[PDB]
């Protein structure tokens, strides 16, 4: 692409060609067009899909989930069409987005009627169906989540930055663990470094040792952070990433922090964290040898609003590890209170 | 971090904050330690045995003859014999088992031509009789905290302490994008496809160097042999698989006397490549049009894979290492007489 | 400068080890340290390298087994001993790449011995 | 795996007397070896660099030359303390290899 870049402080202006990763992050996905494969093709898919014993699909992320929302009325409408006794159910995402076994298949020959195109403007709300086939939702009770399908979409072409372009996906023929790369963007310039996809933005720096400085992430997905996206992948024990590896984090050395391990109990239910360095307001860690072991993570504040002021930790380094999210700060699985009892403090219940 | 971009395929623009990678394959005035400093520390070099310098890059010999009147200036005002006179850059950039050492205080007097001396401190040239690479320095300073930035223009460079082999970070860029992937630096630009595989897809070098690509600066390290590396480790190729072509290893002996090549996968003009299973060994790289102006015509390769590996040099349009031809005698086309 | 490795000892084989090197005048951060070992009646032979940013490389003897790794808090090199075999027996030195690309600083060395 | 072969393996030579020792390589290696003395019990000391090179510290009566796949190593008025084993070691690419040793006695 071609494109220029601005300085404030003197105002005037740099442009050349080359790769530009943009922060797309925060930003509403539900603006788009979403051109799944075809109407006709993806009503034979689910069809085949319920005949084979598949109940219904886990979503590997946002995106699908409104893919999904945007698709569901015509999908039905095409299945009436058809005199199928199936309708498609669409729920709501909630944190970890756990992985299925399942995957949905390519139909040899798609259904022989209804329209050639998404967007057909018009058309007759269908009527519900006994048999029910469901998108993530709260339904991890009519039909568990070993017999849901998972990562079974590959992104063909996109326009995500302008707010009204078409996204096309394709169900693919293979199974795969990895993340689809077709919107990833990694970069380094100097003494900084991103990893970033449509839901992560991963920052890096180069003190004495090159190391995490912060991350945001909106969601937390399960697949894996594909290899050919990652910079200095060699030599890096898995036991050594802040982020988890099976919670698509990427496998570097720009993945750690000196005196930290990995962390698989941190607060990983919440809908959107944020991963920082620093203490939390009104409170202090100091660095004791005497301090309790390593275990699920803490909030900072009680359930009834007070406020935790001393922690302590064995060998780790200042400043702490610290979550910020909605509810308020989370500390590191390496930082416990030096008096109170944990039984006073509300912990994360997940596990990667 | 703030800045606009447009996509002319599909025409369409956009506005936000990101990492932006150029492409820079002039503008900059160098600012070494001090003109106080650089003439102590050639001093304690001269009285310590290292006769002379060998560049890194352009950068550096761009830098020691931008600096090299003032610096023999100081030099000759505080009352030292010696004077320093650089030359031009031959490439490869070799590298030298010495380095500067750092003064403890600068030169006295300081802040106009000099005569010339007959003691000389040679900088990268063709003097290499009155100063050996055996007793030359080679990489020996690094780019200040904040001494680069997109928009800088004025390159403030100190010389190093310690012992290294590694290029300077401070100008290295990669980025990756969906299918579409670069290795860049300020005389690199290497650029990477996903076909069923990702691979090399073509390269333009304005400079061969010899120091290391950090592996900090490189995508997907692991898993990698350096048998498979098309631009060698030795030439400060990037140990990734994003520097790899099936049915090729590693260029040892390309044609890295020129001054600027480009590699593309596409048939120099007027050729024709078959994969023939009758066709001779891997060895030195040929060019095309014989030193009377022929061009030859047919050539073949073992088990390599279409299209064929060129490098497009200023002179010529030179083939992989692995394509050889199947009438005319290789006796009598040009070779390259230089290996990695 | 100062150099004292610390943690060899009589293991037995298909055990584990780990080796510490104390650097004393200067920083490990800044240095390219290296292992090198010298067998009972034999020669020396290197196995590994840590740059200064960071990067390490191995010989194809111990590839897959031995890791390198520092720390700056401590100012202290290791070296992780994995699997280890009957021909892995040595005095273990610490040295500093200097000049040209010779060692300068070597340490005391420490004995392994790998018998059962 | 460039093999470094060295000779002679021995020599017997009285105080006052000339040394000579030469190394091999089994590729180029351009002017990149080193030269080290190891007395028993004790760490190797670097004598030589850059093939001609004289480390800080050493006397001056060491000196070294050679260039492509033949060096060599002389020492000038053999010293009391002069009687210890010498290896040379090339300094070109990964792996760094030594030699097999040679004995300086009498």
């Known amino acids: 692409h071609h494109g220029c870049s601005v300085d404030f402080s003197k105002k005037e202006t740099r442009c050349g060609t080359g790769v530009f990763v943009y922060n797309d992050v925060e930003a509403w996905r539900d603006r788009y067009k979403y051109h799944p494969d075809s109407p006709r093709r993806l009503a034979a898919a689910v069809k085949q899909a319920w005949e084979d014993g598949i109940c219904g699909i886990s979503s590997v992320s946002r995106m699908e989930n409104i893919m999904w929302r945007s698709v569901e009325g015509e999908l039905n409408a095409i299945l009436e069409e058809n005199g199928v006794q199936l309708t498609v159910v669409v729920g709501s995402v909630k944190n970890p987005m756990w992985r299925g076994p399942q995957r949905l298949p390519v139909p040899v020959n798609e259904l022989p009627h209804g329209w050639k195109a998404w967007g057909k403007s018009y058309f007759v709300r269908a009527a519900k169906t006994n048999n029910s086939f469901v998108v993530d939702g709260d339904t991890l009770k009519e039909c568990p989540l070993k017999h849901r399908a998972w990562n079974s979409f590959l992104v063909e072409d996109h326009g995500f930055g302008v707010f009204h372009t078409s996204v096309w996906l394709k169900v693919r023929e293979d199974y795969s663990l990895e993340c689809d790369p077709a919107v990833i963007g990694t970069a380094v310039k100097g003494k900084e470094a991103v990893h970033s996809d449509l839901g992560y933005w991963i920052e890096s720096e180069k003190n004495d040792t090159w190391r995490l400085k912060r991350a945001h992430l909106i969601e937390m997905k399960t697949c894996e952070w594909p290899k050919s996206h990652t910079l200095w992948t060699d030599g890096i024990e898995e036991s050594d990433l802040i982020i988890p590896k099976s919670l698509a984090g990427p496998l570097s050395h720009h993945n750690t922090r000196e005196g930290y391990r990995t962390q698989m109990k941190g607060p990983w239910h919440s809908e959107e964290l944020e991963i920082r360095f620093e203490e939390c307001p009104g409170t202090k860690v100091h660095v004791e040898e005497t301090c309790g072991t390593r275990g699920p993570s803490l909030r900072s504040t009680t359930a009834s609003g007070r406020v935790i002021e001393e922690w302590c930790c064995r060998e780790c380094t200042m400043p702490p590890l610290s979550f910020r999210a909605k509810d308020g700060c989370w500390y590191g699985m390496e930082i416990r209170p030096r008096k109170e009892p944990e039984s006073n403090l509300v912990r994360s219940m997940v596990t990667a | 971090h703030h800045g606009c971009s447009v996509d002319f395929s599909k025409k369409e623009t956009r506005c936000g904050t990101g990492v932006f990678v150029y492409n820079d394959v002039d503008r900059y005035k160098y600012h070494p330690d001090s003109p106080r400093r650089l003439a102590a520390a050639v001093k304690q070099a001269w009285e310590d045995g290292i006769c002379g310098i060998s560049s890194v890059s352009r950068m550096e010999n761009i830098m020691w003859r931008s600096v090299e009147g003032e610096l023999n200036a100081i030099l000759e005002e505080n009352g030292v014999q010696l004077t320093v006179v650089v030359g031009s850059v031959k490439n490869p950039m070799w590298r030298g088992p010495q380095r500067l050492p750092v003064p403890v205080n600068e030169l006295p007097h300081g802040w106009v031509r000099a005569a010339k001396t007959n003691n000389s401190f040679v900088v990268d040239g063709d003097t290499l009789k009155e100063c050996p690479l055996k007793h030359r320095a080679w990489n020996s300073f690094l780019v200040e905290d904040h001494g680069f930035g997109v928009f800088h223009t004025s390159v403030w460079l100190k010389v190093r302490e310690d012992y290294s082999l590694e290029c300077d970070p401070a100008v290295i860029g990669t980025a990756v994008k969906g299918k579409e992937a670069v290795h860049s630096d300020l005389g690199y630009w290497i650029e990477s496809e996903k076909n069923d595989t990702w691979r090399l897809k073509r390269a333009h070098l304005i400079e061969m160097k010899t120091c290391e690509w950090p592996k900090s600066h490189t995508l997907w390290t692991d898993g990698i042999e350096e048998s498979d590396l098309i631009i060698p480790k030795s030439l400060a190729g990037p140990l990734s698989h994003h520097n790899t072509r099936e049915g090729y290893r590693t260029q040892m002996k390309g044609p890295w006397h020129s001054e600027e090549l480009e590699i593309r996968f596409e048939e120099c003009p007027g050729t024709k490549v078959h994969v023939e299973e009758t066709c001779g060994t891997r060895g030195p790289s040929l060019r095309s049009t014989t030193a009377s102006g022929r061009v030859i015509e047919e050539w073949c390769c073992r088990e390599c894979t279409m299209p064929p590996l060129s490098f497009r040099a200023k002179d010529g349009c030179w083939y992989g290492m692995e394509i050889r031809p199947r009438k005319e005698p290789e006796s009598n086309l040009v070779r390259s007489m230089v290996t990695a | 400068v100062q150099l004292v490795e610390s943690g060899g000892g009589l293991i037995q084989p298909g055990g584990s080890l780990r080796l510490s090197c104390a650097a004393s005048?200067?920083?490990?951060?800044?240095?390219?340290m290296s292992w090198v070992r010298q067998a009972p009646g034999k020669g020396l032979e290197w196995v590994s390298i840590?740059?200064?940013?960071?990067?390490?490389y191995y010989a194809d003897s111990v590839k897959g087994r031995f890791t390198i790794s520092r720390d700056i808090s401590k100012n202290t090199l290791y070296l992780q001993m994995n699997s280890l075999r009957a021909e892995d027996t040595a005095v273990y030195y610490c040295?500093?790449?200097?000049?040209?690309?010779?060692?300068?600083?070597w340490g005391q060395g420490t004995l392994v011995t790998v018998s059962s | 795996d460039i093999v470094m072969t060295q000779s002679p393996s021995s020599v017997s030579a009285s105080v006052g007397d000339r040394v000579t020792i030469t190394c091999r390589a089994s590729?180029?290696?351009?002017?990149?070896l080193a030269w080290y003395q190891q007395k028993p019990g004790k760490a190797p000391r670097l004598l030589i660099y850059?093939?001609?090179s004289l480390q800080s510290g050493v006397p001056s009566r060491f000196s070294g030359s050679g260039s492509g796949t033949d060096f060599t190593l002389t020492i000038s008025s053999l010293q009391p303390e002069d009687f210890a084993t010498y290896y040379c070691?090339?300094?070109?690419?990964?792996?760094?290899?030594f030699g097999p040793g040679t004995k300086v006695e009498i």
């Open positions: 840590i740059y200064s940013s960071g990067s390490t």
């Open positions: 070691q090339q300094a070109n690419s990964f792996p760094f290899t």
């Open positions: 005048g200067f920083t490990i951060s800044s240095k390219y």
């Open positions: 590729q180029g290696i351009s002017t990149w």
């Open positions: 040295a500093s790449l200097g000049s040209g690309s010779a060692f300068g600083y």
């Open positions: 850059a093939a001609s």
